Design a protein around this ligand. Sequence first.
Ligand SMILES: [K+]
Ligand SMILES: [K+]
Ligand SMILES: [K+]
Ligand SMILES: [K+]
Ligand SMILES: [K+]
Ligand SMILES: [K+]
Ligand SMILES: [K+]
Ligand SMILES: [K+]
Ligand SMILES: [K+]
Ligand SMILES: [K+]
Ligand SMILES: [K+]
Ligand SMILES: [Mg+2]
Ligand SMILES: [Mg+2]
Ligand SMILES: [Mg+2]
Ligand SMILES: [Mg+2]
Ligand SMILES: [Mg+2]
Ligand SMILES: [Mg+2]
Ligand SMILES: [Mg+2]
Ligand SMILES: [Mg+2]
Ligand SMILES: [Mg+2]
Ligand SMILES: [Mg+2]
Ligand SMILES: [Mg+2]
Ligand SMILES: [Mg+2]
Ligand SMILES: [Mg+2]
Ligand SMILES: [Mg+2]
Ligand SMILES: [Mg+2]
Ligand SMILES: [Mg+2]
Ligand SMILES: [Mg+2]
Ligand SMILES: [Mg+2]
Ligand SMILES: [Mg+2]
Ligand SMILES: [Mg+2]
Ligand SMILES: [Mg+2]
Ligand SMILES: [Mg+2]
Ligand SMILES: [Mg+2]
Ligand SMILES: [Mg+2]
Ligand SMILES: [Mg+2]
Ligand SMILES: [Mg+2]
Ligand SMILES: [Mg+2]
Ligand SMILES: [Mg+2]
Ligand SMILES: [Mg+2]
Ligand SMILES: [Mg+2]
Ligand SMILES: [Mg+2]
Ligand SMILES: [Mg+2]
Ligand SMILES: [Mg+2]
Ligand SMILES: [Mg+2]
Ligand SMILES: [Mg+2]
Ligand SMILES: [Mg+2]
Ligand SMILES: [Mg+2]
Ligand SMILES: [Mg+2]
Ligand SMILES: [Mg+2]
Ligand code: NA
Ligand code: NA
Ligand code: NA
Ligand SMILES: [Zn+2]
Lengths: 56, 128, 90, 48, 102
Amino acid sequence: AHPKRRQSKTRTAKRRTHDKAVMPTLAKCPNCGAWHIYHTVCGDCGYYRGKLAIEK
Amino acid sequence: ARKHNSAEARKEALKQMYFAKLRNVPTSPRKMRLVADMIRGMEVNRALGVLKFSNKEASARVEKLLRSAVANWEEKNERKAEEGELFVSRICVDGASTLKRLRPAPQGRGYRIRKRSNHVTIYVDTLN
Amino acid sequence: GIIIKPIISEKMTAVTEKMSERYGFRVSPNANKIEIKKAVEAMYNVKVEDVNTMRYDGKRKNRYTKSGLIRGKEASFKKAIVTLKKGETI
Amino acid sequence: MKRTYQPSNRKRLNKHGFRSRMATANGRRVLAARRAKGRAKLTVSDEF
Amino acid sequence: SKLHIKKGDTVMVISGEDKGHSGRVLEVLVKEQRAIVEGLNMIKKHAKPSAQGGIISKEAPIHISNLNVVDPKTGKATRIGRRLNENGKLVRYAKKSGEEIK
RNA sequence: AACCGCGAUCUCGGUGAAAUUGUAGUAUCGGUGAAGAUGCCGAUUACCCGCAACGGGACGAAAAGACCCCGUGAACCUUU
RNA sequence: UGUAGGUAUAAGUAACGAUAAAGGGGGCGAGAACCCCCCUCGCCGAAAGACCAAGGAUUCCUGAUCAACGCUAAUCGGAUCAGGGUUAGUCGGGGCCUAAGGAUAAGCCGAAUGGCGAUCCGAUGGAAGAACCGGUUAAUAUUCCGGUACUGAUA
RNA sequence: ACCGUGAGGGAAAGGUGAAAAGAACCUCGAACAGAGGAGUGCAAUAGACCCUGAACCCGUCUGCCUACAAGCGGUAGGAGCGCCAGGUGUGACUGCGUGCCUUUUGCAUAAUGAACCUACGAGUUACUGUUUGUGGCAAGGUUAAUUGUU
RNA sequence: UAAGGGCAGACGGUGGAUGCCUAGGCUCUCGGAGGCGAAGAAGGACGUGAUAAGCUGCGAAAAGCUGCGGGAAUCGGCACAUACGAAUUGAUCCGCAGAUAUCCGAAUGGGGCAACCCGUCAGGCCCCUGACACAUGAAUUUUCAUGAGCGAACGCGGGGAACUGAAACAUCUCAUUACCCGUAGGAGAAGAAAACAAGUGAUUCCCUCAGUAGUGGCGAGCGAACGGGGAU
Ligand SMILES: [K+]
Ligand SMILES: [K+]
Ligand SMILES: [K+]
Ligand SMILES: [K+]
Ligand SMILES: [K+]
Ligand SMILES: [K+]
Ligand SMILES: [K+]
Ligand SMILES: [K+]
Ligand SMILES: [K+]
Ligand SMILES: [K+]
Ligand SMILES: [K+]
Ligand SMILES: [Mg+2]
Ligand SMILES: [Mg+2]
Ligand SMILES: [Mg+2]
Ligand SMILES: [Mg+2]
Ligand SMILES: [Mg+2]
Ligand SMILES: [Mg+2]
Ligand SMILES: [Mg+2]
Ligand SMILES: [Mg+2]
Ligand SMILES: [Mg+2]
Ligand SMILES: [Mg+2]
Ligand SMILES: [Mg+2]
Ligand SMILES: [Mg+2]
Ligand SMILES: [Mg+2]
Ligand SMILES: [Mg+2]
Ligand SMILES: [Mg+2]
Ligand SMILES: [Mg+2]
Ligand SMILES: [Mg+2]
Ligand SMILES: [Mg+2]
Ligand SMILES: [Mg+2]
Ligand SMILES: [Mg+2]
Ligand SMILES: [Mg+2]
Ligand SMILES: [Mg+2]
Ligand SMILES: [Mg+2]
Ligand SMILES: [Mg+2]
Ligand SMILES: [Mg+2]
Ligand SMILES: [Mg+2]
Ligand SMILES: [Mg+2]
Ligand SMILES: [Mg+2]
Ligand SMILES: [Mg+2]
Ligand SMILES: [Mg+2]
Ligand SMILES: [Mg+2]
Ligand SMILES: [Mg+2]
Ligand SMILES: [Mg+2]
Ligand SMILES: [Mg+2]
Ligand SMILES: [Mg+2]
Ligand SMILES: [Mg+2]
Ligand SMILES: [Mg+2]
Ligand SMILES: [Mg+2]
Ligand SMILES: [Mg+2]
Ligand code: NA
Ligand code: NA
Ligand code: NA
Ligand SMILES: [Zn+2]
């Protein structure tokens, strides 16, 4: 229930080894020329798989 | 005269460093360090895309900081950066001052709450 | 001189645009209706019909210094809505 | 759950007010001690 | 305490960056013992646009112990004393030449 | 005993405590020993770092044992 | 098991306070699960609706602000700053009267300080003279405006 | 201030610069939120929490080591690599090694005690005795209260 | 291969140690003074500024009014301010003397939950206002002076503990202390022998006599006076 000892800096950092921020899955627009999330509508131009989806 | 000479030397050194700073951001330094470690060393435009689409909250502020650092590079070089020419050469997150608050606990006890802040520094340089 | 200052506000403007024989003063908190009436007759040479009064305590305010904060108060006052006889203005 | 403090202004002024302190010799002793310490509030009659 | 200089006098700066320069006293700040001398100790103040702004050049006060009354005989920035020459009224006179200061 | 529903639980985004804490790169068995050993001896086993889950040990945490004795200590109660 | 201040560890862990419940479309905005408007859904309904009193004391309305506060964010707020807002002859209270009790007079008691002791004070009780229908503010209304009245003094 | 019905208890908190000259204007950004410049200034790593700016605690970079290894974490040996001319960083591998305080006949003890750092924290003074080191006078030694001149 | 980790150096962050500084304390010396108040105190409430007042000052004459003396160019208090004015015909400022001085408070016209409510009588205005008076006790003869309340220490007086020490405890001690109460003055108290002594000559204070004479479960402890030298 209670820690018998305080943890050292080394022990704490060893546990935190596996803490990381996930990289987003980014695809390039071959025509538009910008970044967007793969399998997601490109919000700059509204196109998805070569077809207009969201009309600005 | 000694302090004047030292200040002149430091000012001359500053002219060849391209950096921006964010100070006193009211947000956990340990949480900001995740994003910093994610984007350390990346090409600048790819890093801008990563920060734009990241699922962490701190990326919104880091994106503005990186844009400001790129603008400082452009001003100190008196030109514009070409595509794929700059990269994130240095980035660190430091702990800042903490706000202390009290939250009531059962049976009359009271506990301290720490609202932490952070500083971020970004350098940019050419892929040499 | 119990009368301190006239009341210029949206409510007073609306009531004067409606009735035109009604005027609002801010006076000392201890002056009753008879003395408010005699005072406005002296100060404006008009005949007064009726007086309505209400007491306001001062607002509590926060004076800000370099180090911290102090708690202060505004002065109390008395409102006096004054109805003149039909025919006269101020 | 009923707690110990149940406010009543009449009771407060009857128990701890300036006139009740001035009524007895020991109340005047309390007032003299508070004046000697220099308290900004002397009785519960001061608070508003 | 009455001062050794007054507004409308001509003084000389005996110490500081403006050492050896004479000017006219414009205003005296008695509480902090400083005076404004015309044309001396110029400062560039940055002012935001208010009642266009800009960079205004202005005069900054000088401590009065750095100012001495100019002798009206050679302009040598003497010391002064006080005497009762003018019909017994106290007046200021220069010590280097003995002439009164008017 | 089986199955079912929601809340807690688990994963992700935001905020973010506490008790505890000599330092720790903190394995097992037998022996030894202030006489029941993570830390000594001799062997045995064991690539580095997490997450979920359970409570055998750390004579685990908490409260300077209330039981027992002691102090020319204290209080209260009774009485020829 | 020493004191003050600062910073750690456990740990990005416990928890975010009733299992009445939410979905969508528009608006404003740099930024929206949460703010504003609309439609649909759900909960209370001898209440979780509407009033009087105690207690609180500007929290009420409006314009700016989102630093701190709000257990998330916030363009929102019972938050910050400024301005505004409470109107009575008839409503309530007090002015009048006494209860318990309290302070006292004449007197009594008592090292002192003081303790008793029938007129006064003292509501939680008694007396109170006396309307209304319609409008009207961002915020007050039996109080303001228009109609119908009543009640007490005074010449 | 805060706490308590009340009597009462009772904090924390000083320092820009000689002079506000307290940063016009530009850039990124919704915004000074913040920063990078420009300018002022001896100095802005003196920029409003502002002199100096330590430790615990938290980061980044560079050098060396580290994924077959087992106990107070050091100590004595000792290759290799790496820096600035005999110094310095790291350290493969080997030997030895159960913290410290207190309390006890005896504690690695599974007896007590401490999260850590900075700061604070415990044989003092007066009088009277007595012994002694060093001195002044010496069959004598010494003044107390107080009084004069300054 | 270093996912991570260890050590060192450099540079940062946080935090606010240290060094330097300060009129804010502490302890005293010398000289004064030793009270304020019914002609209304101490201490408060509410007001008062060109702009809200948090302090300061002042009181409806309200950061202020008048006279005399000093003095000579700025001034209009402070919390990093502008405006607008005053001032050599002498402002502001300093010394002395005056004027005004709301409400509560001994509070004193009666009440009351302090800073409020309600009155009477004489006038003056005009249901309501501003200005008078209206308490009680003691000398006193209804005319008159005096008192009440507050407040540092020092003085005198009336009551008066316990823990503690005696290695328990009761006589004793702590101690005629703490504390409560009453009451003066610049000091108070004492003071001019029905005295000490075995000759001195009123009180008071200092140095000695002296830890002596005594006293005491003769335990723990307590503890003089005569005489001598001084201040006066
Ligand atoms: K009316
Ligand atoms: K009214
Ligand atoms: K000088
Ligand atoms: K302990
Ligand atoms: K708004
Ligand atoms: K400096
Ligand atoms: K300095
Ligand atoms: K530092
Ligand atoms: K070793
Ligand atoms: K034990
Ligand atoms: K006497
Ligand atoms: Mg993890
Ligand atoms: Mg935060
Ligand atoms: Mg997100
Ligand atoms: Mg509670
Ligand atoms: Mg407010
Ligand atoms: Mg869990
Ligand atoms: Mg989470
Ligand atoms: Mg064994
Ligand atoms: Mg074992
Ligand atoms: Mg152990
Ligand atoms: Mg245990
Ligand atoms: Mg024990
Ligand atoms: Mg403990
Ligand atoms: Mg855990
Ligand atoms: Mg909980
Ligand atoms: Mg949970
Ligand atoms: Mg109320
Ligand atoms: Mg509201
Ligand atoms: Mg928030
Ligand atoms: Mg509001
Ligand atoms: Mg009666
Ligand atoms: Mg009643
Ligand atoms: Mg309403
Ligand atoms: Mg903002
Ligand atoms: Mg420096
Ligand atoms: Mg510094
Ligand atoms: Mg092997
Ligand atoms: Mg290996
Ligand atoms: Mg033993
Ligand atoms: Mg041993
Ligand atoms: Mg023990
Ligand atoms: Mg321990
Ligand atoms: Mg131990
Ligand atoms: Mg310690
Ligand atoms: Mg450092
Ligand atoms: Mg007058
Ligand atoms: Mg004069
Ligand atoms: Mg009376
Ligand atoms: Mg005893
Ligand atoms: Na469990
Ligand atoms: Na590493
Ligand atoms: Na009275
Ligand atoms: Zn595309």
